[PDB]
Copies of this chain bind each other. A is one copy, B any other.
Amino acid sequence: LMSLDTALNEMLSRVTPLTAQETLPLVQCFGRILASDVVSPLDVPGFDNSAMDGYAVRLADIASGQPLPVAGKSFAGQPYHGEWPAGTCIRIMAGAPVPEGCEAVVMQEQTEQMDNGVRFTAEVRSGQNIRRRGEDISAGAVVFPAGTRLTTAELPVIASLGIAEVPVIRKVRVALFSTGDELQLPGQPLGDGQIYDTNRLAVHLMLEQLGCEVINLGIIRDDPHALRAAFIEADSQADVVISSGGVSVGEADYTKTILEELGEIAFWKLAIKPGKPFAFGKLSNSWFCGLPGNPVSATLTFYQLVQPLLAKLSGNTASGLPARQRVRTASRLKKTPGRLDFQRGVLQRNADGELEVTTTGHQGSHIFSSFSLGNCFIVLERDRGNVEVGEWVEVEPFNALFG
């Protein structure tokens, strides 16, 4: 019934980003959200210098058209403190400090050499091939805004400004559990209708690579007091509490009355496949997300719903839903209208060199092998139906969590 776009936008609308912070040294900030605009304590370049390798020159001691010799030499790791008589043209590496009061630099190519000087093989216009102090970064400027996620792009650049640490938002904590006497841990033996608990691992794994703090509480026993106490424990320590399956996502039962008793939580029916059901709302101190028991469903549900929610909570100001490009079906695809279909395909380069998807196989939620063989999602539009080879189709790539 409810639209995905609709459900998402309602979830994130109520959410207030964390602002609690902590200062860490640069080598620990990867994936961390900056909390306070990094401000340049210095100018970059710090000094005035030459973009190119050749000869610094003034237009006063050049006009004559006398090939001037060199008085001295500047280097990037070896500056210059000489004189420069009234007729010289100092040599200098690229990046190396321009002599006090130089008005232009000229690279070897625009000059001939001899036993008396450096005949400048072309004209020379002021400011040429001088990189200026602060031209790349001026002191007191903002280099990276708050809410920026730090990677190898930014952190080394902060290292270039002598800043050994920056404040970042604290990691989001996420409590996790599942429930069902039916659920067993590995190494234990499958009893009657008993099955091995898998959503919890998947979710747990996804949280950690999302840079969250996981509080994995295990399987909870099929007992109200056991569950009531799991929520309470989880709520006091988390920003977000996830049920990876077991707890009601709509169906009536003791777990459903426990949710109602501890929080105001919506139970939606979302117009998507795989999946459909989703529990969401506020507990006393955290947000609750409840996934359905089906592996393929809960993954998808989490990746598309819970994942967005965590981004906003985390203080990241990176707006957008993982890039999503248009491409052709090299396969046929049975789509049933009425539901936004997140099918998996395989994005690859074709004979020509253009990208094209291929289905992975049976798109049923009764096998997980899709996520492995696949390397993207094929977002067939809600009212769309069977797709024929050749058509233009919406395709979202897999992020790190898979590939």
Contacts and interface: CB of A to CB of B under 8 A. Distances in A.
A326 interface: yes
Given A27-B204, A193-B79, A197-B159, A402 B186 contact: no
A401 interface: yes
A379 interface: no
A259 to B, nearest CB: 20
Contact of A164 (B42, B46, B185): B185
Interface string A142-159: 000000010111111101
A229 interface: no
Contacts of A79: 192-193
A295 B354 contact: no
Contacts of A189: 162
A153 B201 contact: no
Interface string A63-100: 00000000000011111000000000000001100000
Contacts of A193: 75-79
B366 A403 contact: no
Interface in A322-356: 323-326, 347-349, 353-355
Interface-central residue, A26, A46, A161, A162, by most chain B CB under 10 Å: A162
Contacts of A254: none
Contact of A153 (B76, B149, B196, B402): B402
A16 B215 CA distance: 39
Interface residues of A, number: 76
A153 B209 contact: no
Contacts of A124: none
Interface stretch (A110-118, A234-242, A284-292, A368-376): A368-376
Interface-central residue, A51, A77, A354, by most chain B CB under 10 Å: A77
A131 interface: yes
Given A193-B75, A206-B152, A160 B403 contact: no
A371 B152 contact: yes
Contacts of A368: 153, 156-157, 160
A205 interface: yes
Contact of A160 (B157, B196, B402): B196
A190 interface: yes
Interface of A: 26-27, 30, 42, 46, 51, 75-79, 94-95, 131, 136, 149, 151-157, 159-164, 180, 182, 184-190, 192-193, 195-199, 201-202, 204-206, 208-209, 295, 299, 323-326, 347-349, 353-355, 364, 366-369, 371-372, 392, 400-403
Given A153-B403, A155-B201, 5 more contacts: A51-B366, A149-B403, A162-B186, A162-B196, A325-B354
Complex A-B, nearest 4 residue pairs according to Cβ-Cβ distance, in ascending order: A164-B186, A156-B202, A153-B372, A77-B193
17 contacts: A26-B201, A30-B205, A42-B190, A76-B193, A78-B193, A79-B193, A136-B366, A136-B369, A149-B403, A152-B209, A152-B371, A152-B402, A159-B198, A162-B189, A162-B196, A323-B347, A326-B349
